[PDB]
Amino acid sequence: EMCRDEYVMLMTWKKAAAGEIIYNKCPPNASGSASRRCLLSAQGVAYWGLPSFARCISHEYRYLYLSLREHLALAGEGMSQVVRSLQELLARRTYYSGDLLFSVDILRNVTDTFKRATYVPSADDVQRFFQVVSFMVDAENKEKWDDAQQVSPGSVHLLRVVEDFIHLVGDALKAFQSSLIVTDNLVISIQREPVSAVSSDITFPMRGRRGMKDWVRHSEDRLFLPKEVLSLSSSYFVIGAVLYRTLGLILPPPRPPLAVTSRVMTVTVRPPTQPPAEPLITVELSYIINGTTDPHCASWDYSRADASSGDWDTENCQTLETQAAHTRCQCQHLSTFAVLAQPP
Amino acid sequence: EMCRDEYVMLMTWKKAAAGEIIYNKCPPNASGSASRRCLLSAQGVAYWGLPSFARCISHEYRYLYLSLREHLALAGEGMSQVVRSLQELLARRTYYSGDLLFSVDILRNVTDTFKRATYVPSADDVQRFFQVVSFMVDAENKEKWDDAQQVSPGSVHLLRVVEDFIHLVGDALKAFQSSLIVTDNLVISIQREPVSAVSSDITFPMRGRRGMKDWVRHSEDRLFLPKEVLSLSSSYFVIGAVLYRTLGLILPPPRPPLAVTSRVMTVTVRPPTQPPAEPLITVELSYIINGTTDPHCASWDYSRADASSGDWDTENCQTLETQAAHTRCQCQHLSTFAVLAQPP
Numbered sequence: 275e276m277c278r279d280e281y282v283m284l285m286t287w288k289k290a291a292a293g294e295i296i297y298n299k300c301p302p303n304a305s306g307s308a309s310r311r312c313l314l315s316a317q318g319v320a321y322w323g324l325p326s327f328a329r330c331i332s333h334e335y336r337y338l339y340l341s342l343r344e345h346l347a348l349a350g351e352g353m354s355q356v357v358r359s360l361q362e363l364l365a366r367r368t369y370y371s372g373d374l375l376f377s378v379d380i381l382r383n384v385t386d387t388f389k390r391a392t393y394v395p396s397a398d399d400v401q402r403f404f405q406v407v408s409f410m411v412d413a414e415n416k417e418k419w420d421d422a423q424q425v426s427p428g429s430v431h432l433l434r435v436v437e438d439f440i441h442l443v444g445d446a447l448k449a450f451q452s453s454l455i456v457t458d459n460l461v462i463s464i465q466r467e468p469v470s471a472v473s474s475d476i477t478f479p480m481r482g483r484r485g486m487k488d489w490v491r492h493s494e495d496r497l498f499l500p501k502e503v504l505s506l507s508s509s510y511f512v513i514g515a516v517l518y519r520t521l522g523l524i525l526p527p528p529r530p531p532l533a534v535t536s537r538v539m540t541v542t543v544r545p546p547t548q549p550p551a552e553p554l555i556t557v558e559l560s561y562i563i564n565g566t567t568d569p570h571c572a573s574w575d576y577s578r579a580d581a582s583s584g585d586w587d588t589e590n591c592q593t594l595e596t597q598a599a600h601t602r603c604q605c606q607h608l609s610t611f612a613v614l615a616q617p618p
Numbered sequence: 619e620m621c622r623d624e625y626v627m628l629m630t631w632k633k634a635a636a637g638e639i640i641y642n643k644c645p646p647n648a649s650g651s652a653s654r655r656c657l658l659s660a661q662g663v664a665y666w667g668l669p670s671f672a673r674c675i676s677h678e679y680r681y682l683y684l685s686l687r688e689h690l691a692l693a694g695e696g697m698s699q700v701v702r703s704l705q706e707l708l709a710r711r712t713y714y715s716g717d718l719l720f721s722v723d724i725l726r727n728v729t730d731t732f733k734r735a736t737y738v739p740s741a742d743d744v745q746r747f748f749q750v751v752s753f754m755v756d757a758e759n760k761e762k763w764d765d766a767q768q769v770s771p772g773s774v775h776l777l778r779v780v781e782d783f784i785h786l787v788g789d790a791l792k793a794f795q796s797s798l799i800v801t802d803n804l805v806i807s808i809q810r811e812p813v814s815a816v817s818s819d820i821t822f823p824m825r826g827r828r829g830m831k832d833w834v835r836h837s838e839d840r841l842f843l844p845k846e847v848l849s850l851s852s853s854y855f856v857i858g859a860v861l862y863r864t865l866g867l868i869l870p871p872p873r874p875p876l877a878v879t880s881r882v883m884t885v886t887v888r889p890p891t892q893p894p895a896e897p898l899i900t901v902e903l904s905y906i907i908n909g910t911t912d913p914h915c916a917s918w919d920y921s922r923a924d925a926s927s928g929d930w931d932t933e934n935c936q937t938l939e940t941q942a943a944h945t946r947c948q949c950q951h952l953s954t955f956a957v958l959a960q961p962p
């Protein structure tokens with residue numbers, strides 16, 4: 275059977291035979307290519323899949339990239355303005371799946387220029403960087419990332435610029451100084467400690483601090499990181515912890531029976547640490563959906579080249595009590611942590 | 619213990635008991651009063667402090683004031699000649715601490731007469747005004763200002779006539795026109811923009827312009843003033859930026875641990891601006907001395923009545939990277955900016 279000619283999102287999709295991909299130029303909003311696949315169900319009936327705009331980039335986002343390029347050849351002040359623009363641009367919900375992938379690139383350029391120019395972002399710059407991130411990973415865009423990641427591992431890439439930005443910020447803090455950044459979909463703590471006199475255990479997130487969003491306060495997620503873990507494998511440890519509310523929905527998934535059903539915690543430390551062989555990291559993580567079963571604590575390294583495969587690691591962590599909408603994990607090496615489970 | 623009779627600078631200082639001030643008539647050069655304090659060290663030994671000539675005014679400077687007064691009761695041409703005379707007089711290094719304080723008054727009379735008579739100073743008049751200023755604030759006179767400012771806030775007063783003179787000049791420029799004035803100890807930019815169509819961001823100082831002194835070219839000080847800041851709280855903005863090389867040595871100091879260790883940038887704008895709540899002003903400032911620590915960016919309002927107190931403001935500005943003999947600041951409201959630090 276065949277999918278018939280449709281008009282959708284200002285584009286005509288010519289009749290197509292089951293199993294072939296049709297391509298069209300992106301809407302005049304943008305440039306690139308759009309695609310739609312003529313699928314065949316089980317009963318033998320052909321039906322149109324959804325159209326993909328992963329390779330479409332709104333002119334607005336291209337213009338913002340070119341300005342970014344103007345500033346590079348005062349650079350820092352330029353990147354401050356790029357992120358101001360990007361956030362304003364994203365808030366308008368005028369972007370295709372491919373504009374998200376292009377935003378990750380812009381954030382990398384911004385983050386790489388800040389490091390290259392030794393330009394410490396302002397306080398409002400940090401908050402705005404992570405508010406951009408919060409927009410991008412909002413569940414509202416769960417289907418756009420599903421479409422974006424068929425062409426490029428946008429989440430692997432985003433977590434890596436986030437890691438670079440965290441340590442750009444943390445590298446400017448004073449010894450024993452910390453900072454908290456709260457957004458709709460992330461909470462971030464950046465902490466700096468001397469390698470030879472790490473002051474205390476690291477816990478996170480500190481709910482007592484007024485400013486903490488509700489979804490964290492009325493929650494059970496927490497990190498306990500014993501100071502005994504912060505040991506060397508430059509003169510300061512930058513410790514960053516990120517609790518993503520929704521990121522689990524778009525990460526490389528685990529083997530089929532299971533699924534990322536929890537909030538996600540990243541714990542990055544530079545320089546590299548030699549963790550003890552005993553699992554000494556406590557990671558408690560709330561669930562994204564009521565009704566799960568068979569929890570498996572896991573860690574997943576977005577730094578590896580095969581990061582997009584989704585090789586989750588269930589031997590790093592030990593799964594302990596599951597209760598009150600969360601599960602506790604006891605993990606050995608630092609990484610990105612989640613509770614894999616069978617969804618309803 | 620007592621300080622014994624000394625003869626110094628053509629004056630006899632009678633024996634004095636520790637802690638009392640002795641007074642003498644000024645040298646015959648001048649009129650007024652000189653003073654010297656019999657101090658007591660920690661060990662209990664009395665010793666003469668230095669003599670103060672803050673209240674002495676050389677006859678030469680009094681004669682120049684009386685001529686100033688002749689011209690006022692053709693006035694403008696008179697004030698042109700006063701500044702010609704003052705500069706010639708200052709260049710001769712024949713002045714007491716009190717002649718400096720008297721020069722500030724003369725510059726106010728000159729500046730007030732120019733405004734009162736709507737007499738736009740010539741190009742050579744502007745340059746000569748600021749060359750007078752450069753002489754006066756040269757570090758050579760760092761001890762004279764220390765002596766002058768025990769009786770009158772000469773620097774608060776000088777910065778205010780400078781502000782009045784800048785806006786007298788700037789009020790005569792054409793729209794979008796600018797001017798640069800370079801001296802040994804200051805660099806001044808005066809810029810005029812329409813309130814409703816401010817053309818671009820203001821940066822300063824533009825080192826590319828040949829004519830720029832060396833101490834600025836081989837330096838890192840800079841202002842970035844986004845056009846977004848120039849918003850109203852008459853039909854034109856006069857924007858003046860002054861980078862003082864040495865002024866930090868004689869401004870009201872901060873709390874004891876810290877000290878004005880940097881070059882100083884004033885940024886005046888008339889009419890008054892309503893700045894955004896986000897800190898959008900970038901101020902980079904070089905250090906006056908190698909060896910500082912613990913930098914704190916600060917702003918200080920010489921317009922307030924308590925200006926002489928030295929209420930520096932460290933919440934206006936955010937201190938960012940410190941590197942290559944300067945420190946970057948990100949400030950919210952326009953003012954006079956410096957980097958306070960612990961000196962060696």
Ligand SMILES: *[C@@H]1O[C@H](CO)[C@@H](O)[C@H](O)[C@H]1NC(C)=O
Nearest residue numbers: 342343346378379380382383
């Ligand atoms: C921006 O980042 C992208 C992706 O990381 C890279 O391909 C591109 O070369 C960068 N552009 C600039 C101007 O640095």
Ligand SMILES: *[C@@H]1O[C@H](CO)[C@@H](O)[C@H](O)[C@H]1NC(C)=O
Nearest residue numbers: 686687690722723724726727
């Ligand atoms: C000159 O200025 C001084 C100080 O501002 C003031 O006291 C004096 O009255 C002025 N003299 C004239 C003639 O305007």
Ligand SMILES: C[As](C)(=O)[O-]
Nearest residue numbers: 541542543608609
């Ligand atoms: C520094 As990491 C979170 O990639 O182990």
Ligand SMILES: C[As](C)(=O)[O-]
Nearest residue numbers: 885886887952953
């Ligand atoms: C016009 As101003 C330098 O006193 O803020």
